Design a protein around this motif. Structure first.
Motif, PDB file in Angstrom:
ATOM      1  N   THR A  95       8.815 -23.692 -19.691  1.00 28.92           N
ATOM      2  CA  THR A  95       8.913 -22.515 -19.779  1.00 28.92           C
ATOM      3  C   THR A  95      10.341 -22.145 -19.481  1.00 28.92           C
ATOM      4  OG1 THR A  95       8.303 -20.167 -18.705  1.00 28.92           O
ATOM      5  CG2 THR A  95       8.420 -22.255 -17.030  1.00 28.92           C
ATOM      6  N   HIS A  99       7.564 -18.571 -22.062  1.00 25.31           N
ATOM      7  CA  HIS A  99       6.942 -19.893 -21.877  1.00 25.31           C
ATOM      8  C   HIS A  99       6.968 -20.481 -23.413  1.00 25.31           C
ATOM      9  CE1 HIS A  99       4.192 -17.473 -19.357  1.00 25.31           C
ATOM     10  NE2 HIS A  99       4.956 -18.290 -18.490  1.00 25.31           N
ATOM     11  N   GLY A 133       0.029 -16.540 -23.942  1.00 24.37           N
ATOM     12  CA  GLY A 133      -0.796 -15.884 -22.969  1.00 24.37           C
ATOM     13  C   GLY A 133      -0.680 -14.489 -22.475  1.00 24.37           C
ATOM     14  N   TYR A 134       0.099 -13.807 -23.080  1.00 21.99           N
ATOM     15  CA  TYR A 134       0.391 -12.255 -22.575  1.00 21.99           C
ATOM     16  C   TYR A 134      -0.422 -11.476 -23.229  1.00 21.99           C
ATOM     17  CZ  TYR A 134       4.529 -13.522 -19.832  1.00 21.99           C
ATOM     18  OH  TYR A 134       5.451 -14.035 -18.643  1.00 21.99           O
ATOM     19  N   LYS A 160      -8.359 -17.011 -27.205  1.00 23.29           N
ATOM     20  CA  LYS A 160      -8.256 -18.079 -26.463  1.00 23.29           C
ATOM     21  C   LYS A 160      -7.056 -18.959 -27.261  1.00 23.29           C
ATOM     22  N   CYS A 161      -6.067 -18.914 -26.607  1.00 26.19           N
ATOM     23  CA  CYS A 161      -4.745 -19.640 -27.226  1.00 26.19           C
ATOM     24  C   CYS A 161      -5.035 -21.213 -27.241  1.00 26.19           C
ATOM     25  CB  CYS A 161      -3.603 -19.231 -26.211  1.00 26.19           C
ATOM     26  SG  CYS A 161      -3.396 -17.666 -25.891  1.00 26.19           S
ATOM     27  N   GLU A 177      -4.778 -23.155 -20.453  1.00 29.44           N
ATOM     28  CA  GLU A 177      -5.864 -22.688 -21.434  1.00 29.44           C
ATOM     29  C   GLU A 177      -5.656 -21.054 -21.345  1.00 29.44           C
ATOM     30  OE1 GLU A 177      -8.056 -23.787 -23.423  1.00 29.44           O
ATOM     31  OE2 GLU A 177      -7.368 -25.678 -22.881  1.00 29.44           O
ATOM     32  N   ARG A 178      -4.571 -20.617 -22.095  1.00 26.16           N
ATOM     33  CA  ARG A 178      -4.216 -19.088 -21.913  1.00 26.16           C
ATOM     34  C   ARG A 178      -5.208 -18.464 -22.779  1.00 26.16           C
ATOM     35  NH1 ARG A 178      -1.324 -21.245 -25.287  1.00 26.16           N
ATOM     36  NH2 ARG A 178      -1.707 -23.198 -24.250  1.00 26.16           N
ATOM     37  N   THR A 179      -5.100 -16.974 -22.442  1.00 26.19           N
ATOM     38  CA  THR A 179      -6.085 -16.184 -23.153  1.00 26.19           C
ATOM     39  C   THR A 179      -5.322 -14.723 -23.449  1.00 26.19           C
ATOM     40  OG1 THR A 179      -8.025 -17.389 -21.953  1.00 26.19           O
ATOM     41  CG2 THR A 179      -8.650 -15.238 -23.292  1.00 26.19           C
ATOM     42  N   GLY A 180      -4.388 -15.008 -24.615  1.00 29.86           N
ATOM     43  CA  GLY A 180      -3.762 -13.742 -24.817  1.00 29.86           C
ATOM     44  C   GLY A 180      -4.390 -12.642 -25.840  1.00 29.86           C
TER      45      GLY A 180
END
Lengths: 603, 52, 463
Positions: A137, A147, A324-325, A376-377, A382-385
């Motif tokens: 990041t 990131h 993730g944003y 879900k990225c 496990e990002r969820t943007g």
């Protein structure tokens, strides 16, 4: 390499383009104007030169770049105004003092010499990294927390990870090796703009978009990652609504793009965002300009670049989504994009399916809107943007039967209908309740229930009251003010109050600039509860006279409380949530007590 | 009472019914012509150019 | 410097049709290259090449294609885009549609040639407007104000005095002054005007003494229709040179914006292009954008361009494509009512649609009063309610106007009588007019007023 054969406005024809593939970026003429293949025929091919084509000549060199439309989506894009071709406006102006945009400049999308404080993640040597894995990041600036992620379609074992410190974009960071060969990864990543960035999965969104405007927040809410459409006929100035959303939404990042937007608006944005501050949980002053990027090219800019502008905007939004944003993008005046499609297609003699707009309009607009959503990225963590798209379809002549408006309404989920009637009356939001509709109401039922179970019932009752108000207005206009039922009088009352207080926001005053959700719920509950008390009084008032006929006398004797109800909107949100909630409790209880006592009196 | 009712009906007709229907007819004529005729002629011209 | 080349001369015209002249066997054409055609009779006329294909070049002449022979006319390729010889000396003179002098004076000695349709302003460099203008009319400065860099047109159908209003504005124009060398240098484009109106403009501008600071660009209807499009271009090019590269503020005036539109429709139909609404070209939004979206305040320079066009609703319908596109782009509008003109009001401005999008920045503490915004909002909102009251009174009767409706009707009547009206040369200053504006607002009860807070007007004091 190649040479120009025919030029017709934005669309040109080049000979000796045998090896060229469709949608490959190409350099045109001595000035190396940007171009993208659209129609290839024989050895020749067609190019839509995004730049201005005036002054070309036959046999001007045409150089094939072999690569499709691409945007340098590395770090540092945040807080910078970029052209439709991602060119940096401020850097161009600094390098060439001439304020006029030059033709033939090749300034890179992002500076190769900026030093960024690079924070490596928990990655270790030899670890099995995959596409989309956040290996580190970087802090672009305050509240950025960029990131750096491995580009998709890349994998291997970590043979080298760069140490923490300042880094030029040329510097290699990861040296993953998948099939023996050890490839280096630099900060810059380029994505074919037209192709949609990959997502691990698409998931239902259940987080409402808090616009800060009562009418849109309550009557026609939108979920984060949803798709919206604002017609905004001429004179409505939808851009103030768009700017308000950009300032006071709960989004992590804002990507404002204006295709065909007037230049003053972008000046206004760039001059006013830095001073305006948003308060985070830490509370420190911070400028939304850091949070916002501008891709807009003004109406003076060539029309061929409208597509490129909108697609670069949406791909930058997608890039931030994969980080993730939760990002929201506003597309000012997609009608200008439709006109650009018509102009480009007109030159190719492509047959006009409807009103000059080519047949393949719904498809492209559908793809543009469909890139939105909650996903879900890829990679680890496990990002969820998400990406939220709120476009604008300006109706030529203010008739929603227009083709672009028709296709948008066909493929849009939540729709906010701007009308000329409220705009003329200086209502300000000008959001007509009848035409506007939200398909996201069912989804946000869980959020509404957990927040306040009353919200659904009060919302439905307000909708019914508004519909009854419209019907009664029509009936009265047909018949006359007289012979008006006392119950109908009570219905028209507090509906006028709804229109005057809850459905309208000044949008230029400190109190009405931002409306928190809780105070909106309180105002709606006050209105509906006054209406319900009026209905109860009509039901029983020791005779039909005191019950309903004396509603006028009730208004006379309850004038102070009704004035408090209409003035509840006037209070500023700076008082803080406890102050507003206490004041609203006091107002509601005082209204109920006064109404019951007056209903108790003479009954 | 009867004269008041009749005068109200007549005034309402003159002020709303015709004043709304005439714009409806004008909008229908404008849409019909400027869309159907214009686009049909344009399609025919484009086909003629294609053949040419 | 690279050695110069004398322009090539051709005679290979191989087909004429409509306003277009076709050429063949052209050696190295150039797009939008200006050509100056000489006919067999010896007369000359200009034109632009619209498409370049192979050795072919399709040219649309300016003066019309009549009298052109396939085997005697000669075409010369100047090898450059159209350029207007802009210079500081151009002030206080008149020019034809193409820019040829008509003031019985010598041709302009250019300081530097500037290609018209110049590149846009880098939006990073454009800056917002923040300075009001003393045009010389009360109702514009009091409500729906103008900022030095703001574009806003005048909407006015046929038969209205809008041309006289524009002449009054141009003669009475001036800075707020709350100097002369950098003062307003007015450029007055005239797209497609009648000969009598042209003579009126010439006489009014010459007699007013504004010829020390005003340049006219007259283009009559008798001129070639294409020469009409290049006019409100050349005008904006000269305005840009005078404001940004020369410093003095410019207040460009365009008349008959509709005539420009017609000029486009005619040219587009000649070119056989894709039609938008009502047969107008589909790209007219772009081609108006290129005209309107020039006025503004570039940062690096102290100049400023302010655009005040004049439209003409063809069927007296704001829904026509030209006013629709304008209202989309032009950042507000000033509206003129035919009914008020019938009521014998010299400035027949209808304030109900007359709004200035940039007025929120024109107002402030540098000029105007702290109650200007609230007074404007009240006099803009209560007028609509008074009109609704008048409609209800018409559809029911005189007794329909209750104790509250009657106040609104009286407010509307007094507003149409006193506030809107003004003298033919009235420089009614802002404070004196705002006094009676608050008087009109106070005709209604000082507490029934919903939108305005009483404290805002309480900051101001009567008498």
């Amino acid at each position: 390499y190649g040479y120009v054969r025919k030029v017709s406005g934005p669309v040109v024809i080049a000979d000796g383009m045998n090896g060229a593939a469709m949608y490959e970026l190409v350099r045109v003429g001595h000035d190396n104007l940007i171009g993208e293949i659209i129609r290839l025929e024989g050895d020749s091919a067609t190019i839509q030169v995004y730049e201005e084509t005036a002054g070309l000549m036959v046999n001007d060199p045409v150089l094939r770049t072999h690569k499709p439309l691409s945007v340098e989506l590395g770090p540092g894009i945040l807080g910078n105004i970029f052209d439709g071709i991602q060119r940096p406006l401020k850097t161009i102006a600094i390098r060439s003092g001439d304020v006029y945009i030059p033709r033939g400049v090749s300034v890179p999308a992002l500076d190769k010499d900026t030093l960024w404080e690079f924070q490596p993640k928990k990655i270790g040597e030899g670890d099995l990294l995959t596409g989309g894995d956040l290996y580190a990041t970087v802090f672009e600036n305050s509240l950025m927390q960029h990131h750096v992620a491995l580009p998709p379609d890349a994998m291997g074992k970590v043979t080298y990870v760069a140490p923490a410190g300042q880094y030029s974009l040329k510097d290699t960071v990861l040296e993953l090796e998948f099939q023996g060969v050890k490839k280096s990864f630099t900060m810059l990543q380029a994505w074919p703009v037209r192709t949609p960035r990959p997502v691990s999965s698409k998931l239902a969104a259940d987080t409402p978009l808090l616009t800060g405007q009562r009418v849109l927040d309550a009557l026609f809410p939108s979920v984060l990652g949803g798709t919206c459409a604002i017609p905004g006929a001429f004179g409505c100035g939808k851009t103030v609504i768009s700017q308000a959303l950009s300032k006071y939404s709960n989004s992590d990042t804002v990507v404002y793009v204006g295709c065909g937007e007037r230049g003053n608006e972008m000046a206004e944005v760039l001059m006013d965002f830095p001073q305006l501050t948003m308060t985070l949980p830490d509370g420190r002053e911070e400028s939304v300009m850091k949070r916002t990027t501008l891709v807009a090219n003004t109406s003076n800019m060539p029309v061929a670049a409208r597509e490129a502008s909108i697609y670069t905007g949406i791909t930058i939004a997608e890039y931030f989504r994969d980080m993730g944003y939760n990002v929201s993008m506003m597309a000012d005046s997609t009608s200008r994009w439709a006109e650009a499609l018509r102009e480009i297609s007109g030159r190719l003699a492509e047959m006009p399916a409807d009103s000059g707009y080519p047949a393949y309009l719904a498809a492209r607009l559908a793809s543009f809107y469909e890139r939105a959503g909650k996903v879900k990225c890829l990679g680890g963590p496990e990002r969820t943007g998400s990406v939220t798209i709120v476009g604008a379809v300006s109706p030529p002549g203010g008739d929603f039967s227009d083709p672009v408006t028709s296709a948008t309404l066909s493929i849009v989920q939540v729709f906010w209908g701007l009308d000329k009637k409220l705009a003329q009356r200086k209502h300000f939001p000008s959001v007509n309740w009848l035409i506007s509709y939200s398909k996201y109401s069912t989804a946000l039922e869980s959020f509404y229930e957990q927040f306040d179970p009353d919200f659904i019932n009060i919302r439905t009752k307000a909708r019914e009251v508004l519909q009854r108000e419209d019907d009664l207005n029509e009936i009265v206009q047909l018949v006359g003010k007289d012979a008006l039922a006392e119950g109908d009088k009570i219905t028209l009352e507090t509906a006028k109050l709804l229109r005057e207080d809850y459905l309208a926001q000044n949008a230029f005053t400190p109190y009405d600039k931002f409306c928190p959700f809780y105070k909106s719920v309180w105002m709606m509950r006050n209105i509906i509860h006054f209406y319900n008390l009026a209905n109860q009084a009509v039901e029983k008032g020791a005779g039909m006279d005191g019950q309903k006929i004396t509603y006028t006398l009730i208004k006379h004797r309850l004038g102070d409380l009704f004035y408090r109800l209409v003035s509840q909107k006037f209070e500023d949100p700076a008082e803080g949530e406890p102050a507003l909630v206490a004041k609203f409790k006091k107002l509601h209880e005082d209204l109920t007590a006064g109404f019951r006592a007056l209903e108790d009196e003479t009954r | 009472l009867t004269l008041d009712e009749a005068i109200k009906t007549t005034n309402r007709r003159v002020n709303a019914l015709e004043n709304v229907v005439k714009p409806r007819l004008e909008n229908t004529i404008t849409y019909i012509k400027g869309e159907l005729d214009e686009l049909e002629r344009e399609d025919f011209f484009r086909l003629k150019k294609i053949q040419g | 410097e690279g050695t110069l080349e004398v322009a090539m001369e051709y005679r290979t015209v191989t087909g004429v049709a409509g306003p277009l002249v076709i050429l063949d066997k052209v050696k190295g054409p150039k797009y939008y290259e200006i050509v100056n055609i000489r006919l067999g009779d010896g007369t000359m006329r200009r034109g632009q090449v619209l498409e370049v294909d192979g050795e072919k070049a399709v040219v649309q002449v300016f003066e019309g294609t009549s009298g052109i022979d396939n085997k005697f006319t000669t075409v010369q390729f100047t090898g450059e885009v159209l350029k207007t010889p802009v210079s500081l000396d151009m002030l206080g003179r008149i020019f034809n549609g193409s820019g040829k002098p008509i003031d019985n004076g010598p041709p302009i000695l250019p300081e530097a040639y500037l290609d018209i349709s110049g590149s846009s302003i880098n939006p990073s460099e454009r800056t917002y407007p923040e300075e009001m203008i003393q045009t010389g009319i009360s109702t514009i400065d009091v409500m729906n104000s103008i900022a030095r860099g703001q574009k806003i047109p005048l909407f006015s159908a046929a038969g209205l005095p809008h041309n006289e209003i524009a002449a009054q504005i141009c003669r009475q124009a001036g800075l707020v002054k709350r100097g002369e060398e950098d003062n307003f240098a007015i450029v007055f484009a005239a797209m497609g005007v009648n000969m009598e109106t042209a003579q009126f403009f010439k006489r009014d501008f010459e007699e007013n003494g504004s010829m020390e600071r005003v340049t006219l660009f007259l283009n009559l209807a008798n001129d070639p229709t294409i020469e009409r499009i290049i006019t409100p271009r050349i005008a904006l090019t000269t305005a840009e040179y005078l404001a940004y590269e020369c410093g003095k503020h410019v207040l460009v005036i365009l008349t008959d914006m509709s005539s420009y539109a017609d000029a486009l429709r005619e040219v587009s139909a000649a070119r056989e292009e894709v039609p938008g609404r009502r047969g107008y070209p589909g790209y007219m939004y772009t081609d108006l954008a290129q005209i309107y979206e020039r006025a503004g305040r570039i940062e690096g320079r102290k100049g400023s361009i302010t655009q005040i066009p004049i439209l003409t609703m063809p069927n007296d319908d704001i829904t026509h494509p030209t006013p629709d596109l304008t209202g989309y782009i032009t950042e507000g509008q000033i509206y003129i009512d035919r009914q008020l003109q019938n009521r014998q009001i010299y400035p027949p401005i209808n304030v109900l649609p007359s709004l200035s999008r940039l007025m929120k920045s024109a107002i402030g503490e540098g000029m105007t009063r702290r109650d200007h915004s609230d007074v404007s909002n009240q006099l803009y909102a209560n007028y609509a309610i008074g009109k609704d009251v008048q409609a209800m009174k018409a559809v029911v009767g005189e007794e329909a106007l209750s104790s509250e409706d009657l106040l609104y009707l009286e407010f509307l009547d007094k507003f149409e009588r006193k506030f809107v009206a003004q003298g033919a040369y009235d420089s009614r200053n802002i404070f004196q007019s705002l006094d009676l504006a608050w008087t009109l607002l106070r005709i209604f009860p000082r507490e029934l007023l919903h939108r305005i807070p009483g404290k805002t007007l309480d900051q101001y004091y009567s008498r």
